[model samples]
Target: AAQTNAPWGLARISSTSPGTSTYYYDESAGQGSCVYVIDTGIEASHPEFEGRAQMVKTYYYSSRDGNGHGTHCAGTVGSRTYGVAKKTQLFGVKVLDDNGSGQYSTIIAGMDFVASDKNNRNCPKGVVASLSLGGGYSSSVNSAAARLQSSGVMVAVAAGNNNADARNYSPASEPSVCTVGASDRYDRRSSFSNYGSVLDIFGPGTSILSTWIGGSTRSISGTSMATPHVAGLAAYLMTLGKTTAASACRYIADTANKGDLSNIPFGTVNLLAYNNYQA
Candidate 1:
């Protein structure tokens, strides 16, 4: 609550396809669960988010969202008819404010809020924290991320939009986090989605439609937009009571639309490995 890019809007309904594709809800309006949307303030009042969702709490480190990227990114995770994980409670942390960037302390402070939830009596358990921002990682960042992981939160982050083999900045590059890169509709890596030995899986982040301020809708693209697709799905998996990070990630990796071995780095969704649970 000290300082973070608190998301403004939370739950939303469907205007797209067979919703189960991402947010793992039994129905658009069922399966009670929660997710922490740490971004540039989410739009919790979007019309599409009427009764299906609610903003459980908010923590803000910044007050302004001049570029609206944080809000836009927030919407991509769930905005009316265009999201994967609906029927979820969202915690907002506005760290970036107006500058479209946040200090590491602000980010960690937001994480502290999430970690406290399970013990706070004021908050509930099994909450997943989704952070779509991070850069140029450091040992301090790794230690902070480890604290997040140690707190038993399912964390998801962007792998970066650079299309380079090396991952950019902090949290995303952290080994403990599930780094998500962008994948096209056909399940191939977007040219811009970062790749490396740490990339866990790819999510739909290509030219996708999402919410904007003033209640307008627009189509946007970038790995930033795509990371939430996976984040949303992760929420669903957890909602279904996915117990552990490895198990939850195993589901996505197993279900990902597997493809050619040449460009696809993870290799056939690790189907063989997922079943090998003994490992």
Candidate 2:
């Protein structure tokens, strides 16, 4: 299939950038997994996703996206054309509002619902939590994320966009979670991405296009945009029988491009989708 609207991030991670006409797709494109996004509500009706996305829980704006960040991030994680894992189920748990602001408690509640296996019937196999927003450190959020990781959930959070040390951010600084930074179209680290020892991986986030609000598509920046790339990749790994947080991280670090990024920090940089699933 050829289209003018395919996401550039997908093309890059799939080993086919804009210049090439071939798009290598995966047979295990998150066929049997799910990603729980804790962010602003998503536009469930976005055409790019069809009915694969929905607001499962809400802490702000009553499960409706007053702003469209969540929808865009959802598109990247599991939409048909914009997503990394086109078949993975997407559940949006609204933590931020239309203005993209929220309290730490809102994020905690959203994580709990997704990570809990006692109540969820749709994804009994497991789940990956995607967090595209961040704030100053929060102990409760860290503890909750750690608990989920202990139970085999792969949590992916942004390393922040402040260009400061990511160790000061809440979920990003949290242990046992995948903290992701932003990379550009040329496999260079995004200038505004937060870095340092806390980052676990890098992803295509700069000038990256994805599904947007009002049934449209657009491009955005920040580590927030990069978070879903890892999340979607994690979901695809799960479909291939890669369960558990530790194993998922190990597989990604081992199989991902080890030297793609040039000027990133010593302990940061693992650009995603290198050696992707064979179709």
Candidate 3:
């Protein structure tokens, strides 16, 4: 059965219809893959997760989510009611503090942990990491993300919310990572979403509705919100045998809906994320 009255973001990816209000997806698209949400944290017990989401590591105070950002990102990644990959395993890697702020050191530590853990677990399906955070350029952070990608973890990062060239940001500008910008239901680049040649693709980000803290839901916007959609889609692609990080990235680019977006910055790629749906 198709999901009716679905969130606009989810609906948009599954259909080319400008008036689509239902989401059609592969029920097993993410069954064997895992998605690591590297951010403030995740409310692992949230009912939306249906027992699949967990906070496995913390570089901050605790494994719990004090800020709602991580949980929201996780929801978009794999929540049963609000996710792109409904069956993917969701892991929370907390690096940012309750205020949704973190030092480069803390962020890199989380990346290192994911790289090691994914290798150790030897997940046969594939592993993807969603990074909905970014700052000014940091060579160390970029290097860390590159190393993580080299370790076979497909990384999807935000292009930042500054509305400036993404080249000015770290990790997003990193060549190895799939840097994502934000688009809206109208297929227009988000006003606050950073743009540049560095952005690999754009995902729905404006007024996104997803699980929040305390078992609730909220609507928000940012490139931060957009990145997880790609992360989840990447995980889905992996389940379909585009298992390698590099291959999944290539498939995403090759399969994206091209030239349908409006107000894309001069240097930004005019590509919108798609789930390879045929309807």
Specify the highest-TM-score model's number.
Answer: 3
Candidate lDDT (C-alpha), each: 0.57, 0.78, 0.88
Kindly indicate the candidate among 2 and 3 with the higher lDDT.
Answer: 3
lDDT-best of 1 and 3? 3
Per-residue lDDT over 1-279 for candidate 1, one digit per residue giving the tens place of the 0 to 100 score: 000111211111111221223222345321355566777766666675545434434344334344556556656555545555545565556766666677788777777766776454222325566777777766676567667767877777777877665345667777777777775544456777777877776666666667665666677677677677666666656655544544555566665544432255542221110111110
Could you give candidate 2's per-residue lDDT for residues 14-39 as a string of tens digits? 66232332345656678768788788
Query: What ordering of candidates by lDDT runs from best to worst?
Result: 3, 2, 1
Error of 3 at 134 (Å): 0.4
Q: By TM-score, rank the candidates, best first.
A: 3, 2, 1
**Model 1 global lDDT (CA atoms, 0 to 1):** 0.57
Best by lDDT: 3
Relative to the unseen true structure, what is the C-alpha lDDT of residue 154 in candidate 2, on a scale of 0 to 100? 84
Q: Candidate 3, 59: how far from true, in Å? A: 1.6
Candidate 3's TM-score: 0.97
Compute the lDDT of residue 148 as modeled in candidate 2: 69
Q: Which of 1 and 2 is the better model by lDDT?
A: 2
Q: Report how far residue 201 has shifted in candidate 3, in Å.
A: 0.4
